[PDB]
Swiss-Prot record, chain A:
InterPro entries per record: NA-bd_OB-fold, Ribosomal_uS17, Ribosomal_uS17_arc/euk, Ribosomal_uS17_CS, Ribosomal_uS17_N
Classification via Pfam families: Ribosomal_S17, Ribosomal_S17_N
The name this protein goes by in its record: Small ribosomal subunit protein uS17
Modified residues (Omega-N-methylarginine): R59
Organism: Oryctolagus cuniculus
Gene that encodes it: RPS11
rRNA-binding recorded as keyword: yes
UniProtKB/Swiss-Prot annotation, chain B:
Post-translational modification: Ribosomal protein S6 is the major substrate of protein kinases in eukaryote ribosomes. The phosphorylation is stimulated by growth factors, tumor promoting agents, and mitogens. It is dephosphorylated at growth arrest.
Glycyl lysine isopeptide (Lys-Gly) (interchain with G-Cter in SUMO2) crosslink site(s): K14
Subunit note: Component of the small ribosomal subunit. Part of the small subunit (SSU) processome, composed of more than 70 proteins and the RNA chaperone small nucleolar RNA (snoRNA) U3.
Organism: Oryctolagus cuniculus (Rabbit)
Protein name per Swiss-Prot or TrEMBL: Small ribosomal subunit protein eS6
GO MF annotation list: structural constituent of ribosome
Shown stretch of the complete protein: 1 to 60 of 249
Swiss-Prot record, chain D:
Taxon lineage: Eukaryota, Metazoa, Chordata, Craniata, Vertebrata
Gene Ontology annotations of biological process type: ribosomal small subunit biogenesis; translation
Keywords, sorted A to Z: Acetylation, Cytoplasm, Isopeptide bond, Nucleus, Phosphoprotein, Ribonucleoprotein, Ribosomal protein, RNA-binding, rRNA-binding, Ubl conjugation
MF GO annotations: rRNA binding; structural constituent of ribosome
Chain's gene name: RPS9
Name the record gives this protein: Small ribosomal subunit protein uS4
Subcellular location(s) of the protein: Cytoplasm; Nucleus, Nucleolus
Residue ranges that the Swiss-Prot or TrEMBL entry lists as coiled coil: none
A single GO cellular-component term on record: cytosolic ribosome
Family that this chain belongs to: Belongs to the universal ribosomal protein uS4 family.
Subunit structure: Component of the small ribosomal subunit. Identified in a IGF2BP1-dependent mRNP granule complex containing untranslated mRNAs. Part of the small subunit (SSU) processome, composed of more than 70 proteins and the RNA chaperone small nucleolar RNA (snoRNA) U3.
Function noted in UniProt: Component of the small ribosomal subunit. The ribosome is a large ribonucleoprotein complex responsible for the synthesis of proteins in the cell. Part of the small subunit (SSU) processome, first precursor of the small eukaryotic ribosomal subunit. During the assembly of the SSU processome in the nucleolus, many ribosome biogenesis factors, an RNA chaperone and ribosomal proteins associate with the nascent pre-rRNA and work in concert to generate RNA folding, modifications, rearrangements and cleavage as well as targeted degradation of pre-ribosomal RNA by the RNA exosome.
Transmembrane segments: none
Signal sequence segment: none
Length: 143, 60, 262, 62, 206
RNA sequence: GAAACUGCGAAUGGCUCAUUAAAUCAGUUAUGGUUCCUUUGGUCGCUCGUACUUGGAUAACUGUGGUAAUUCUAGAGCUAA
RNA sequence: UCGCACGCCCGGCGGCGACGACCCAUUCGAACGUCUGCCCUAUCAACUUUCGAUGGUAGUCGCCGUGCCUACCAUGGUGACCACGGGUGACGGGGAAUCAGGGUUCGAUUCCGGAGAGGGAGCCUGAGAAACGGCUACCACAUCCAAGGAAGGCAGCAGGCG
C-alpha cells in the first residue's frame, strides 16, 4: 500500500525507529472549525500536501466548488460557478473558473459533482493553491 | 629606445636614450621582473645587474 | 523602482497632516522610525505648520539642530523624524510639553501637557516574544522591545511607560468597560467604552465601542488603543474629548459661540 | 511635476438654439434694463441660477 | 543568466505569455554545485540580502546522527550508493539531499563499546593485542559495574545494523543540502526505511 | 586647510509610453512561504581559553616618463587608518 | 577606533557622546501569491504535450513557495460560460468631455503602479540594479587620429536637424 515510489515515504516529524523492548502518525486540526476526518487519524497514508497530515497551513480564503474532474494524481479540479453584473444591462452572465485543487487521500470516496470546500494555502505546484478541507455529498446519491 | 634607469638605494633615476642594438639585444627577448646583467650598456656599466620592470610602447 | 523611494509628493502625502497644495511639489518624506509613515506627523510639519515657531525648512533645521526639541525624553535632531501617536514633545527652552494625541476629527492636536504627566506615555503592545533564555518581550506600537514584562500583560493591552527609564509602571487590559482612543479608520480620534468584542478567526476581529453620548460604532481591533479602566483615562483628553458632534451640531456650535462672541 | 493648480471652470453656457428671436429680445431687454456689457453677463447669471436650481431639484427629490 | 521565472512559460490554458519586462536580478539561477567526494573544497557565494551560501564542491566528512541510540559523530563519507532521483548521480558520486551514502562505522563502534561495553562487529576469535578495546570492556568498579550491568539489557541492536558494523560501513541518508549549507550532514538509516533502501539497492544490483 | 585613501550616495529624482490584453493595473487579502542599508528599541564580562595597543603595504607629496590623443597611466622613493 | 570637558581614590577609578557590529524586533519597503474585473475579431474552433503542457515523488538552483530546472512515473490541462490565434491610431488606474435617466467617447500628460534608456544579451559593486548621466560583447549608427589606436548613447534641461 505504502512505499510505491523511489524514496522512502514517511512523515518528517515522526521518529519511527526507537528501540523496542503500529507507528504514531502526525496530524493536526487546521482551524476554522474543520473537523479532521477519521481516516486521517486511522489511515496509513503519507502526504506532504494534505492539510491534516502534512506541511501546509490553511490561511487566507475558504472557498467552495463542485468536483468536475478527478483524472489527476491526488488533485482534482473544482468548478467555481458565479454570476457577473454589467452596469449597462441590469442583468447578469453566468461565468465559471475551473481551478485545480489538491485533494488529500484521506477523502477516500468522492465522485464528481460533490460540493467540496477548499482553503488557500502555500502554492503546492504551478497552478494549484488550495486544499480540499471538507466534502459535502451531492444531492441524492446516498446509496 | 629610451631607458629609465633607477637606483633605489639612493632614490635617484634618469632617462638615457640609446640606439645601439648591440647594447639592446642583451635586454631583448627577456621577461619582466628579471635581473639582466647590464654590462653591455657602456664603458661605465660593469658589474651592474638591473631588474627590468617593464615600460611603455611606441604608442604609449 | 530599483530600490527604496526617498522622495514624497505634496499631493500624495497623508491628509491628516493638512498640507496645502501650492507651496511646493514635495512634502517631507519622514525618516524611518518607530511609527508608520502614513500614521506619523513629522517634526518639520509639527514645528512649521502647527505651532508656527518656524517659517521655513532652514528655520526648522536650525531649531532642531541647536538641540532644543526633545521627543519622548530623548534628543531627536533630524527634522523628518516621525513623531507619532502618544509621543511627548519636550520643548525645554520655551517650556512646553506636547502629547501627539488625535483630535475629534482625524488630526493630531496640539495638546499642552504638564511635566508630571509628560514624564510618562502610554503604549499599546503589539507582540509577546520570548527571547533566548525564556526572557519575555513586549513589542509596543512604537518599536519598543521591553524585556522582562509582567506576565499578566497580553497582546492587545496598553502599558504606562516611564520615559527616562523605559520601564513599565502600570497597565490596562483589553476588557469590556475600559476606555479607547481609536487609532485608525473612519472613526479615527473617537473616545468610548468597549461595548463588544467579536471574534473572527482569520479575519480581522472587530470591536464595538460606545462613546459618552450614546453613539455606538465598530472598528477593527488594530485601530483601538485603550486608555484607562472604566471611563477614567490615564492621560488627558483634547478639546472636545473625542465625541464627533455631527455637522449640524458643529454648525450650531460655531454660530452659537460666535454670535455670543459678536 | 510642477506645483500649481490647473483648476478652472466656465461660468456660463451658450444656449443651444442661437437665433431664437424671443430669447434674443429678452436677453437684450435685460442688458438694457441693467446696463450689461454683452450677452455673456446674461448667460453667466442664468448659469449660476441653473446650478442653484439643480442643487435645489436634487435636494427636493431627496 | 539562468532564470527562475514563471513568465517564460505557458499558462494553465496552454497559452503563450509574452513578456513585459526583461530578466531581473531576483529571477536568478546559478549552476549546480554537484558536490563530489574528496578533500574539502567550499566556495562562498554572496546572495540576495548580502548573506552567504556555501557551495561544497568536493567533500569528505560530515556528522551523522544514529538516532535510535542518539549518538551523532563526525564521520568520513565512503561512497554514494543510492539516489532516489537519478541513477547517474549514483554512477558519479554526487552528495545531494536525501541520497544514500556510506560512512565508516568506527566512531559508532567506539561509542557502543564504550557505553554498553559489549563488542559489535568483531568476528569472534580475534582480540586486539593493543589491548585498549579490552581495557575499555573490562576492569571497572563495583559501583559502576551495576550501572553497566543494567545498561547492558538495552544493548541489543538490529541485526541489519550489526552486519553493517561487521562489514565496517553503514548506510546513511544525507539530510542537509550541501550546495546550500556547505555540509554533508544526515542520519544513519535503521529500521523499515533501512530495509526499504536495502531491497532497493539489491534489486538494482540484480 | 587644498590633495588623496576611507565611509556614504550615485538603485532617488526627471523624461517618454515602444513593449504589454488576466499581462500590467484596481479593489482585496496572504507571506504560518521570503529578503531588507537605514532609522527607533532591545541586545552587545552569559563562552572557562604586546594588551600601557601587533604586522606590512598603498594613494596624496617629490622625482624620471611614454602616446598624436582619453577623467590613459608606468617604473622608483616615502607615509597614515 | 575617534571627540569633548577634566574630576575622584592612596598607579587605579571615572561622566557625556561619535562610529561600527552577529542576531531579534521596528520603519521604508521590495518580492512572489488568493478572489474578481479588460476593447475589436470565428474571413481564428480547437489549442497545449515526451523541446514542460497539467499533476506526483526525490533532488538542483533560488532570498523564499513553486515544473523554476533536472530524473523517473501519471496523461493530464484549457475550450461555445468564446479558450487558442490575430488586431489595437492599447501602458493600467485615480480621472476628462458630453449629458434628463441610462449611456457614448477619451485618459501619452504633472498622483499611484508598470515598462525602457537606439535594438537585443550578459554581468561587477552593493542591503537594494540585470543600473546604461556603470561595464563588456554583437547589430545599426556615429566622433577624433600621426591609420597604431581612442571614445560614445538627450524618451534629463535648454538647444539643433529630420
Ligand atoms: Mg443600465
Ligand atoms: Mg524614478
Ligand atoms: Mg498597434
Ligand atoms: Mg502602444
Ligand atoms: Mg494614463
Ligand atoms: Mg501615442
Ligand atoms: Mg509615473
Ligand atoms: Mg530600468
Ligand atoms: Mg532616441
Ligand atoms: Mg541596460
Ligand atoms: Mg543621458
Ligand atoms: Mg537614472
Ligand atoms: Mg524640469
Amino acid at each position: 500500500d505504502i512505499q510505491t515510489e523511489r524514496a522512502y515515504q514517511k512523515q518528517p516529524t515522526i521518529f519511527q525507529n526507537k528501540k523496542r523492548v503500529k507507528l504514531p502518525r502526525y496530524y493536526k486540526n487546521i482551524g476554522l472549525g474543520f473537523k479532521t476526518p477519521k481516516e486521517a487519524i486511522e489511515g496509513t497514508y503519507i502526504d506532504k500536501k494534505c492539510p491534516f497530515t502534512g506541511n501546509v497551513s490553511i490561511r487566507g480564503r475558504i472557498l467552495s466548488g463542485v468536483v468536475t474532474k478527478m483524472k489527476m494524481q491526488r488533485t482534482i479540479v473544482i468548478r467555481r460557478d458565479y454570476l457577473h453584473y454589467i452596469r449597462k444591462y441590469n442583468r447578469f452572465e453566468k461565468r465559471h473558473k475551473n481551478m485545480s485543487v489538491h485533494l488529500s487521500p484521506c477523502f477516500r470516496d468522492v465522485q464528481i459533482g460533490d460540493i467540496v470546500t477548499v482553503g488557500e494555502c502555500r502554492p503546492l505546484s504551478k497552478t494549484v493553491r488550495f486544499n480540499v478541507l471538507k466534502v459535502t455529498k451531492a444531492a441524492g446519491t446516498k446509496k | 629606445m629610451k631607458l629609465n634607469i633607477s637606483f633605489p638605494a639612493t632614490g635617484c633615476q634618469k632617462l638615457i636614450e640609446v640606439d645601439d642594438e648591440r647594447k639592446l639585444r642583451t635586454f631583448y627577448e627577456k621577461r619582466m621582473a628579471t635581473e639582466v646583467a647590464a654590462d653591455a650598456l657602456g664603458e661605465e656599466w660593469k658589474g651592474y645587474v638591473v631588474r627590468i620592470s617593464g615600460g611603455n610602447d611606441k604608442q604609449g | 523602482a530599483r530600490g527604496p523611494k526617498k522622495h514624497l509628493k505634496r499631493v500624495a502625502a497623508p491628509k491628516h497632516w493638512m498640507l496645502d497644495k501650492l507651496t511646493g511639489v514635495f512634502a517631507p518624506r519622514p525618516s524611518t522610525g518607530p511609527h508608520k509613515l502614513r500614521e506619523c506627523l513629522p517634526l518639520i510639519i509639527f514645528l512649521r505648520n502647527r505651532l508656527k515657531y518656524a517659517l521655513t525648512g532652514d528655520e526648522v533645521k536650525k531649531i532642531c539642530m541647536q538641540r532644543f526639541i526633545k521627543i519622548d525624553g530623548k534628543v531627536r535632531t533630524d527634522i523628518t523624524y516621525p513623531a507619532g501617536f502618544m509621543d511627548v514633545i519636550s520643548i525645554d527652552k520655551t517650556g512646553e510639553n506636547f502629547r501627539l494625541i488625535y483630535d475629534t476629527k482625524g488630526r493630531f492636536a496640539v495638546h499642552r501637557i504638564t511635566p508630571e504627566e509628560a514624564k510618562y506615555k502610554l503604549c499599546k503592545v503589539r507582540k509577546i516574544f520570548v527571547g533566548t533564555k525564556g526572557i519575555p518581550h513586549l513589542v509596543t506600537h512604537d518599536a519598543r522591545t521591553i524585556r522582562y514584562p509582567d506576565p499578566l500583560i497580553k497582546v492587545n493591552d496598553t502599558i504606562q511607560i516611564d520615559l527616562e527609564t523605559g520601564k513599565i509602571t502600570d497597565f490596562i487590559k483589553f476588557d469590556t468597560g475600559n476606555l479607547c482612543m481609536v487609532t485608525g479608520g473612519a472613526n479615527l480620534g473617537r473616545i468610548g467604552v468597549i461595548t463588544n468584542r467579536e471574534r473572527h478567526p482569520g479575519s480581522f476581529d472587530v470591536v464595538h465601542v460606545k462613546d459618552a453620548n450614546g453613539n455606538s460604532f465598530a472598528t477593527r481591533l488594530s485601530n483601538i488603543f485603550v486608555i484607562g479602566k472604566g471611563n477614567k483615562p490615564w492621560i488627558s483628553l483634547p478639546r472636545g474629548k473625542g465625541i464627533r458632534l455631527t455637522i449640524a451640531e458643529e454648525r450650531d456650535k460655531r454660530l452659537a459661540a460666535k454670535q455670543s462672541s459678536g | 511635476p510642477v506645483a500649481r493648480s490647473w483648476v478652472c471652470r466656465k461660468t456660463y453656457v451658450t444656449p443651444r438654439r442661437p437665433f431664437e428671436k424671443s430669447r434674443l429680445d429678452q436677453e437684450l431687454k435685460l442688458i438694457g434694463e441693467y446696463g450689461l456689457r454683452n450677452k455673456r453677463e446674461v448667460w453667466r447669471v442664468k448659469f449660476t441660477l441653473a446650478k442653484i436650481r439643480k442643487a435645489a431639484r436634487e435636494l427636493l427629490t431627496l | 543568466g539562468i532564470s527562475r521565472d514563471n513568465w517564460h512559460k505557458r499558462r494553465k490554458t496552454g497559452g503563450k505569455r509574452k513578456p513585459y519586462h526583461k530578466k531581473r536580478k531576483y529571477e536568478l539561477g546559478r549552476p549546480a554545485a554537484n558536490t563530489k567526494i574528496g578533500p574539502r573544497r567550499i566556495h562562498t557565494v554572496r546572495v540576495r540580502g548580502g548573506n552567504k551560501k556555501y557551495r561544497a564542491l568536493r567533500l569528505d566528512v560530515g556528522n551523522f546522527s544514529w538516532g535510535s541510540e542518539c549518538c551523532t559523530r563526525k564521520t568520513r563519507i565512503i561512497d554514494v550508493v543510492y539516489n532516489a532521483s537519478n541513477n547517474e548521480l549514483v554512477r558519479t558520486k554526487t552528495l545531494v539531499k536525501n541520497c544514500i551514502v556510506l560512512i565508516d562505522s568506527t566512531p559508532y563502534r567506539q561509542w557502543y563499546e564504550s557505553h554498553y561495553a559489549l563488542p559489535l562487529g568483531r568476528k569472534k576469535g580475534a582480540k586486539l593485542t593493543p589491548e585498549e578495546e579490552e581495557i575499555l570492556n573490562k576492569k571497572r568498579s563495583k559501583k559502576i559495574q551495576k550501572k553497566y550491568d543494567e545498561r547492558k539489557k538495552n544493548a541489543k541492536i538490529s541485526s541489519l545494523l550489526e552486519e553493517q558494523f561487521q562489514q565496517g560501513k553503514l548506510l546513511a541518508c544525507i539530510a542537509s543540502r550541501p550546495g546550500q549549507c556547505g555540509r554533508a550532514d544526515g542520519y544513519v538509516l535503521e529500521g523499515k526505511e533501512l530495509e526499504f533502501y536495502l531491497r532497493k539497492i539489491k534489486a538494482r544490483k540484480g
